[PDB]
Amino acid sequence: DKISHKIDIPDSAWTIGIGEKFKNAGHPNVKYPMIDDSYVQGAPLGGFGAGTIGRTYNGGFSRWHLEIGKNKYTTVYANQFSVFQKVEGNKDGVAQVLYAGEPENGYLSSWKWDYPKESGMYYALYPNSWYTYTNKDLPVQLAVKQFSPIIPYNYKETSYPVAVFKWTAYNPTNKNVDVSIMFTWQNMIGFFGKQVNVNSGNFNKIIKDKSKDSEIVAAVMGNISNDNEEWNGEYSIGVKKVPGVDISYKAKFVTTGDGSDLWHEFSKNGILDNKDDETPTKQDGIGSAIAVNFKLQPGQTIEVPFALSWDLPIMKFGGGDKWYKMYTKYFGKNGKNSFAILKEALNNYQKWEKMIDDWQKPILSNKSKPDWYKTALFNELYYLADGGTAWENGKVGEKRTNNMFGLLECFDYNYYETLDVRFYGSFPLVMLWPDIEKQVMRQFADTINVQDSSEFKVGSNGAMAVKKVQGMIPHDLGSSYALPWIKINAYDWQNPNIWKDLNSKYVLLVYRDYVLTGKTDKEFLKYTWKSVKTALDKLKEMDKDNDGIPDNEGIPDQTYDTWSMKGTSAYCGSLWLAALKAAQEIGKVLKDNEAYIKYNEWYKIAQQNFEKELWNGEYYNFDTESDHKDSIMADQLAGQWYADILRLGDILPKDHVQKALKKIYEFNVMKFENGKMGAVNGMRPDGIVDESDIQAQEVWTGVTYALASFMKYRGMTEEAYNTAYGVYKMTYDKSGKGYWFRTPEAWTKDGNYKASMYMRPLSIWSMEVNY
Ligand SMILES: [Ca+2]
């Protein structure tokens, strides 16, 4: 490996061998189907709301999230980088697709597949990833840096449906070597959203944009139809000329054939035919190819940038609504702008690289933080783009001031912005894209007094319940299968209108978002204040026994939606105390004296009773009335965690909080698989995992990272990082279960998972205490 020194890969990048097999991998162990796309994943490409494309460590473009809200795992084999090399004065060169695998059927059988093992590495530090190619039959070593411009406090480039692939080639040998790099792409119009004749009308064109000291050559893969539909638009691939390289291309090869129409050209001398052909296809799949060829002398390095863009302006959801995607604000809505997007990337990618470096540097340059922690912190952010992210710029046919946003809970439970989960999962939004975060919370504010009296069947018991109750915060903002932002509470396993955490978590989220953006946005507090008061006032009515605390009802009426709580619970009770303290403070800021006094009185009464009911001398009991009420819950003091973040001070005595956290570390962490897997949710006082419900026996990755945040705030630094380390180990390490770029909600002690690609573990950003 002589190429790694020519490029700048951080030591904290997650690393795996190209073609590596992973032996230990976890799977769901479940009654009903659950997504399991394997451990062959990688960092995604694409901006927020753009649709994303998962290119795996094996090189394949395989995890398609281009249909917003859907996860489709299938390798489009035509989409590749390939290399040709010939040592000067040899009869023949060699050609190789840079993919560690081969097609299932006979399509593209002419191409040289099966890139060998032990011949390169994949590296990831989101939003960047890299591949190196260090192959005994390729004298010139290659690397590529690939990324999209995901940039905190930037709402423009961060939206773009674009990726850059910056190649470096180096010749460590003492012979001249002729080298070509070729990007192939299938014209994927019709891959989704088209009900009949999936390729019909697809056509490819070549654009050569020549200007002083500049040439871009690109293929634009579109359809002859000018229909404005979800399925229609364009893909583009292209390259920018640099000194010492020539460009060649082929506008049209057949992807539903043996591929030799292209490969016989590339494998001869790495130079394509430069044949334009705009003839539309009917049944056959088609694709385009862009290549560069160059001669490298001994010791010579060259850098060349390629790019990929996708202008698919319209997203359609299952309930029929069609919306424009955010990036259309910058490029237009007509779906004929892929070249413009690609050109912007090829002419600005160096600036984008620096902008990314600028926001990663503060963390990377902090040598007090271990690299493993940095690996997790950056790579967990994959989910902000990969989570079915929807970011609208108008209804098709509809203009407002704001752009509604939603991130999915996950793909198995296809719910936008699940509030009980975003309480944990939304840290990167508030910390890095706060204008999005505030927009989402205003969306929830707007729903508070919505009433929908139509009834739905509750999954857990089969009872009928009212869809949406006035004054209760919704569970979610809908599903991609139905009508995001329009039809809320898509979730039906339980009835969220009687949840005891949603209203308090909502208030806490509001005040968090004010505090973590500088305590200056009084307008945001003013917008949400009536909803905050309504939320707490409704929840107060659920106090059945006049102790001043809402009562859990012997059912799962909160985020642990199969784990019953009854009476006063540590979880909902602490959240309530913290929410009251937040509302007092908002009252003070807005000069609403009567609210301050009311919520101060509620707080003092509830705080006194919480402590009396639950403090047992060592920790806070799970609740007052359940069968295993003295279980040690990992999340027992979630309210105090948020109070620490919100600078609301002590809701419970310092000594008791410290004792509780130490108990959780000693038991839920250290007595669960030797502390190597996170914090199990429920442990009995005798040191055995609570078996009352499956959720008690699970580690929740997002709960664990939040708990590590809590410990860090409380000066339990070693316990904090040791607690978080087990989640990192399980996700990313060779000794773990292979969950990189699909971090799940949960695992059990055997490592098997629930709900891969989950929002909650974005809570790791709550560990950025100093930030
Ligand atoms: Ca009560």
| 3-state SS, one letter per residue, for 631-693 | CEECCCCHHHHHHHHCCCCCCCCHHHHHHHHHHHHHHHHCCCHHHCCCCECEECCCCCECCCC
Ligand 1 midpoint to CA 613 (Å) = 10
Say if residue 337 is in the same domain as residue 455: no
178 vs 294: CA distance, rounded Å: 6
Residue 447 sits at the vertex; the CA angle it makes with 441 and 449, to the nearest 5 degrees, is: 130
655: annotated binding-site residue?
A: no
Ligand 1 midpoint to CA 610 (Å) = 9
Say if residue 334 is in the same domain as residue 462: no
Ligand 1 midpoint to CA 457 (Å) = 28
Cβ–Cβ < 8 Å for 335, 233:
yes
Header resolution in angstroms: 1.8
Give 612: exposed, middle or buried? Use CB within 10 Å, 0-12, 13-18, 19+.
exposed
Say if residue 172 is in the same domain as residue 299: yes
219 vs 206: CA distance, rounded Å: 5
35: annotated binding-site residue?
A: no
Ligand 1 midpoint to CA 574 (Å) = 13
132 phi and psi, to 5 degrees? -115, 150
Give residue 539's identity as a one-letter amino acid code: L
Say if residue 580 is in the same domain as residue 528: yes
Say if residue 403 is in the same domain as residue 346: no
- Evaluate the CA torsion angle 574, 578, 581, 586 in order and state its sign: negative
Ligand 1 midpoint to CA 713 (Å) = 30
Say if residue 425 is in the same domain as residue 349: no
Give 511's contacts (C-beta < 8 A, 6+ positions apart): 582, 583, 585, 586, 646, 648
569 vs 613: CA distance, rounded Å: 9
Say if residue 335 is in the same domain as residue 411: no
Say if residue 214 is in the same domain as residue 267: yes
322 phi and psi, to 5 degrees? -120, 130
Method of elucidation: X-ray
Cβ–Cβ < 8 Å for 662, 710:
no
Say if residue 445 is in the same domain as residue 501: yes
Ligand 1 midpoint to CA 576 (Å) = 11
Ligand 1 midpoint to CA 89 (Å) = 86
Give 588's contacts (C-beta < 8 A, 6+ positions apart): 596
Say if residue 301 is in the same domain as residue 400: no
Structure tokens at 756: 């891969």
Q: How many CB atoms lie within 10 A of CB 362?
A: 11
Say if residue 352 is in the same domain as residue 371: no
Q: Based on the structure, what is the number of domains in the chain? A: 2
Ligand 1 midpoint to CA 566 (Å) = 10
209: annotated binding-site residue?
A: no
CA distances from 434 to 20, 510, 516, 706 (A): 39, 12, 9, 19
393 vs 82: CA distance, rounded Å: 37
Cβ–Cβ < 8 Å for 327, 159:
yes
Ligand 1 midpoint to CA 573 (Å) = 9
Q: Which of 340, 364, 388 is the last residue of a domain?
A: 364
| 3-state DSSP helix/strand/coil % of the chain, to nearest 5 | 30, 25, 45
Ligand 1 midpoint to CA 552 (Å) = 8
Say if residue 71 is in the same domain as residue 212: yes
Q: Which of 364, 399, 434 is the last residue of a domain?
A: 364
Ligand 1 midpoint to CA 547 (Å) = 5
* Structural domain that includes position 521: 365-771
Give 501's contacts (C-beta < 8 A, 6+ positions apart): 420, 423, 558, 559, 571, 572, 575
Q: Which of 338, 364, 390 is the last residue of a domain?
A: 364
Structure tokens at 690: 């609570």
Ligand 1 midpoint to CA 526 (Å) = 30
543: annotated binding-site residue?
A: yes
Ligand 1 midpoint to CA 545 (Å) = 5
CA proximity to 635, closest of 705, 562, 536: 705
Ligand 1 midpoint to CA 575 (Å) = 14
Ligand 1 midpoint to CA 570 (Å) = 12
Ligand 1 midpoint to CA 468 (Å) = 23
549: annotated binding-site residue?
A: yes
Ligand 1 midpoint to CA 509 (Å) = 23
Ligand 1 midpoint to CA 569 (Å) = 10
Ligand 1 midpoint to CA 451 (Å) = 26
